[PDB]
Design a protein around this ligand. Structure first.
Ligand SMILES: C=C(C)[C@H]1CC=C(C)C(=O)C1
Lengths: 216, 295, 338, 126, 56
């Protein structure tokens, strides 16, 4: 009776599902996170509810999401983002007042149970303002151990100590405990971000493929 | 009557029993091993990737190859008969050549897939859509069948002179060509062209792919696992190709057949056993799928 | 003065607690200890469904106990046919992020929603024959967490705005709004008579709302963390609550207090789905440890395990006939147990 | 129901000493990680220090390191905070927070404006 | 800011203070009576034979 029609309908729908599977597997997804003062809007609009943007690099398609229409509590809707390729994390380097909040957010994301495989690509924005602020508020006020730090920029060597001290905290939190971290120094006027994201995603996928064949 | 007589691997009857059971044991293991892996691919949906598609193809090819080559010798040794008909020899030769060529091409196909997967991580899905996999498999099978048919037809036409006694334990090409009445110069030329085309290129491709893979891994305890896995794979690949290269490409047939029999034995039966124990059974995914199927 | 109001709050809380303690003369478990246990409950999977690409958050059975609908995170809504494993409709969503789904009591309509803050209603009985979007309900601030049909003209939704609302499908405007929670509202459930409904929040609190009036009749507390699931007893005078502290609890409306707690020392993972049986004797609970458990609702003793999944279990449902169970997971696999 | 009471604040001259005590009821103490937060007038919530389940690992913020100490007592179900040599910029309202879920080493939404598991806090002036 | 929610909590508690509350034993017996009344129509409690099973 209706069994023949149901078989035909099932075949028709399965053909479309097989067609859409490849398109689903073709693109790479990314999640953008940051603070209000951070210039993540400029970052996401440089290559151009939930705001999506699409960009193509070397015939590879990326798709990154920015969620800003929700409230300030994120312990519940973050679990949906456990399948993304990478989490872009934008941090201001010129605001010493709110650096501890960024550190705590990074630690919470790092130690989350459903995000123990996702990698984080770290952008440290606002370097031009940091250089002017350091060259001319002192960072020793909010971090005592800066009095005992030694460097591991080109215009003046006093900026290098601070701009590496700020990164060393995130690196220490990352190495204190599968997934890695990729720090980067960037300004507001810079067009190299897409290439950096491309290289980081290429490295992540290469490591995953190496683990797949049990070469590691 | 146009039958043939096979002298077997050995002449002394005191070695008939032990070898027999040993060989018998061999056969069973291979069967089980191959069958097992096929099941673990058909049931679990986690392992639906081109790598495991190629692995399943290889396991099926090994099953067919072993079932073609092994049981006849055991039956002849058990029953004591040493005769074989013309059609049996022809069919054995045809299946032997087809499966050998198909495996030789499938190894290079797998090597190319590995190279693409590792050295182009982002373009991998675009380059390995299922259409490409099906076309590669179909091309390998078609080429194997073509060369096997050419060899069988061009070989069985010539008459045989003198006795119908073959110094081998199964129907081979080099043993048959030496009894031919007519000139074998064209036979030698065709066989040499087929040998070089079906052997030398895949070995070079596999070696280049492995070299590039290890170079990329070097540019990254990580190194030791990669070295161990690559050495384990290269052992089997080198054995399988070196035995055939020594056999079919030897000059002037200077070497006595007494060691040639065991040289052929090294690549006839052992490599189908070694294939699953190296490529498949040591994977963590295979172990997890087996435990899930049991549980 | 905020201090005087804060004080009055605690004297009223003390009065409520004193009344609850005085009202508790005995315990349900002591009375139910006289009945014989049900033994061991062993079910085997009878059907498995494949076709989704990403994980699964929600599902819903039909009133005819034959068809069901599932929503997946790759942007797909698939209607199945559990009898012959065939599948009838596949609808692509506007937004890839979907958290809930519903199936109309008459089977004509389907609904969906998620992070897009929009509720979408799809028509299944179009004259052309294809599925077409019919209405987009807008007005919420946070993400939608649950939606349930009252009839073919009304629908009640709960959002991450710490609010619930009742809509009018023909016009697409909120007739009534329910407020009073402090955190996110996670799930809701309609009474068998469709006259009242309960709602659980991330404030470790449940509330009982009246549909027509628009006021909160009573509230229940007793948990220690966020509440993920809730459902009525088939009688309509009790319900069960599952939270993230790895404990289930049973409340009753008339006594206005707690009856039983279902917990074990081996479990340290929260509950994501709670459902009852047709007779109300069995309570099925899904955990984060990749398994499910069947508790005796009158003895608090585990009577079986459902260990067929290798990832987190997100949705769990029981047919209206009480003859089959459907359990989804983050594997893109649906399983039917009998 | 989770209930938290803070006490011990009051007037203090600069360079003095102070004790803040928090009492918790309605939940098991030893399964949760505990936090102290503060809010200055005309400013947002600021994280101060925290202590783990058993007290093995404690963490501090930048501006109070070497001056404040935090401790817990599971038998009495209480939390403590010591203040020594108060700076004039330490006047604020203090709250005691709680980890949203047990058996976790991460904390989400602890300094949010509408958190549910936190106390009313006490006022400290210098 | 917090005055409105405090007032709403005050009226909510005031209105919830005066409710009818029956003894626990009444609901305890009612639930048992309902469970035993409909115990014969639960195919999951008593496994259904394959003769009428639609998922054979
Ligand atoms: C591994 C084999 C059986 C090959 C041996 C040599 C040639 C030329 C073949 O075609 C088959």
């Amino acid at each position: 009776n209706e069994e023949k029609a149901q078989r035909e309908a099932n075949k028709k729908i399965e053909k479309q599902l097989q067609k859409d599977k490849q398109v689903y597997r073709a693109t790479h997804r990314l999640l953008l996170l940051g603070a209000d003062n951070s210039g993540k809007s400029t970052i996401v609009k440089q290559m151009r509810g939930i705001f999506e943007t699409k960009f193509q690099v070397d015939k590879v398609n990326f798709h990154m999401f920015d969620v800003g229409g929700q409230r300030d509590e994120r312990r519940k809707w973050i679990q949906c983002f456990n399948d993304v390729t990478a989490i872009i994390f934008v941090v201001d380097s010129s605001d010493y007042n709110r650096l501890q909040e960024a550190l705590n957010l990074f630690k919470s994301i790092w130690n989350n149970r459903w995000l123990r495989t996702i990698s984080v690509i770290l952008f440290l924005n606002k370097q031009d303002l940091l250089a002017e602020k350091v060259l001319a508020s002192k960072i020793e006020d909010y971090f005592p151990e800066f009095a005992r730090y030694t460097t591991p920029p080109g215009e003046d060597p006093r900026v290098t100590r601070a701009k590496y001290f700020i990164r060393d905290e995130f690196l220490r939190i990352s190495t204190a405990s599968r997934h890695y971290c990729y720090p980067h120094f960037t300004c507001a006027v810079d067009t190299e971000n897409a290439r950096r994201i491309f290289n980081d995603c290429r490295d992540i996928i290469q490591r995953m493929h190496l683990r797949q064949y049990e070469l590691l | 009557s146009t039958d043939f007589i096979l002298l077997g691997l050995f002449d002394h009857p005191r070695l008939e029993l032990l070898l027999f059971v040993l060989i018998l044991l061999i056969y069973l293991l291979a069967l089980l091993g191959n069958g097992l892996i096929i099941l673990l691919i058909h049931l679990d949906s986690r392992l639906h990737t081109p790598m495991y598609f190629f692995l399943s193809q290889l396991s099926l090819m090994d099953l067919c190859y072993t079932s073609t080559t092994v049981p006849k010798m055991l039956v002849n040794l058990l029953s004591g008969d040493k005769t074989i008909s013309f059609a049996g020899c022809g069919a054995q030769l045809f299946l032997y050549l087809t499966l050998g060529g198909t495996e030789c091409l499938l190894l290079a196909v797998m090597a190319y897939d590995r190279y693409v997967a590792i050295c182009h991580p982002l373009r991998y899905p675009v380059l390995m859509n299922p259409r490409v996999c099906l076309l590669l498999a179909a091309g390998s099978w078609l080429l194997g069948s073509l060369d096997s048919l050419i060899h069988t037809v061009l070989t069985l036409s010539l008459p045989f002179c003198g006795s119908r006694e073959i110094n081998h334990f199964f129907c081979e090409v080099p043993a048959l060509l030496k009894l031919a009445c007519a000139d074998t110069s064209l036979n030698e030329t065709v066989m040499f062209v087929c040998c070089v085309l079906m052997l030398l290129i895949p070995l070079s491709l596999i070696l280049v792919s492995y070299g590039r893979i290890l170079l990329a891994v070097l540019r990254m305890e990580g190194r030791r696992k990669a070295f161990s896995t690559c050495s384990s794979h290269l052992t089997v690949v080198g054995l399988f190709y070196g035995a055939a290269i020594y056999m079919y490409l030897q000059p002037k047939s200077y070497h006595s057949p007494e060691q040639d029999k065991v040289v052929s034995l090294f690549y006839t039966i052992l490599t189908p056993m070694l294939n699953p124990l190296i490529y498949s059974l040591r994977n963590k995914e295979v172990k997890g799928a087996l435990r899930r199927v049991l549980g | 003065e905020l201090d005087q109001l804060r004080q009055e709050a605690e004297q009223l809380k003390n009065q409520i607690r004193d009344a609850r303690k005085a009202c508790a003369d005995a315990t349900l478990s002591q009375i139910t200890n006289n009945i014989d246990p049900v033994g061991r409950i062993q079910m085997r999977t009878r059907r498995t469904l494949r076709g989704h690409l990403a994980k699964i958050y929600a599902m819903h059975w039909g009133t005819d106990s034959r068809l069901l609908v599932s929503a997946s995170q790759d942007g797909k809504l698939i209607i199945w046919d559990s009898y012959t494993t065939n599948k009838v409709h596949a609808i692509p969503l506007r937004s890839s992020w979907v958290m809930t789904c519903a199936y109309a009591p008459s089977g004509n309509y389907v609904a969906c929603g998620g992070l897009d803050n929009i509720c979408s209603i799809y028509n299944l009985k179009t004259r052309e024959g294809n599925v077409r979007v019919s209405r987009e309900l807008a007005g919420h601030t946070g993400y939608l967490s649950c939606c349930r049909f009252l009839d073919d003209n009304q629908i009640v939704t709960s959002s991450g705005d710490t609010t619930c609302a009742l809509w009018d499908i023909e016009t697409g405007q909120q007739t009534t709004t329910f407020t009073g929670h402090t955190g996110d509202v996670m799930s809701l459930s309609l009474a068998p008579d469709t006259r009242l409904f309960v709602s659980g929040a991330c404030d470790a609190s449940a509330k009982l709302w009246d549909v027509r009036e628009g006021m909160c009749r009573q509230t229940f507390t007793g948990h220690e963390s966020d509440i993920n699931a809730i459902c009525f007893f088939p009688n309509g005078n009790a319900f069960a609550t599952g939270s993230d502290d790895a404990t289930c609890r049973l409340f009753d409306l008339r006594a206005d207090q707690e009856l039983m707690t279902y917990s074990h020392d081996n479990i340290i993972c929260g509950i994501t789905s709670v459902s009852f049986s047709k007779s109300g004797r069995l309570l099925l609970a899904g955990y984060d440890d990749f398994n499910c458990n069947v508790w005796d609702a009158l003895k608090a003793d585990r009577a079986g395990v459902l260990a067929g999944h290798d990832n987190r279990v997100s949705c769990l449902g029981v047919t209206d006939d009480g003859m089959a169970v459907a359990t989804g997971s983050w594997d893109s696999f649906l399983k039917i147990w009998n | 129901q989770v209930q938290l009471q803070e006490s011990g604040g009051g007037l203090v001259q600069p360079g003095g000493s102070l004790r803040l005590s928090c009492a918790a009821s309605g939940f098991t103490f030893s399964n949760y990680k505990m936090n102290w937060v503060r809010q200055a007038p005309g400013k947002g919530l600021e994280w101060v220090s925290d202590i783990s389940q058993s007290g093995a690992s404690i963490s501090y913020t930048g501006s109070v390191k070497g001056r404040f100490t935090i401790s817990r007592d599971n038998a009495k179900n209480t939390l403590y905070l010591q203040m020594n040599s108060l700076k004039p910029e330490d006047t604020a309202v203090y709250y005691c927070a709680r980890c949203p879920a047990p058996f976790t080493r991460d904390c989400f939404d602890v300094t949010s404006t509408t958190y549910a598991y936190r106390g009313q806090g006490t006022q400290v002036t210098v | 800011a917090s005055i409105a929610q405090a007032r709403k909590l005050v009226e909510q508690l005031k209105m919830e203070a005066n409710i009818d509350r029956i003894k626990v034993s009444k609901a305890a017996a009612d639930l048992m009576a309902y469970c035993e009344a409909h115990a014969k129509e639960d195919p999951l409690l008593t496994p259904v034979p394959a003769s009428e099973n639609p998922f054979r």
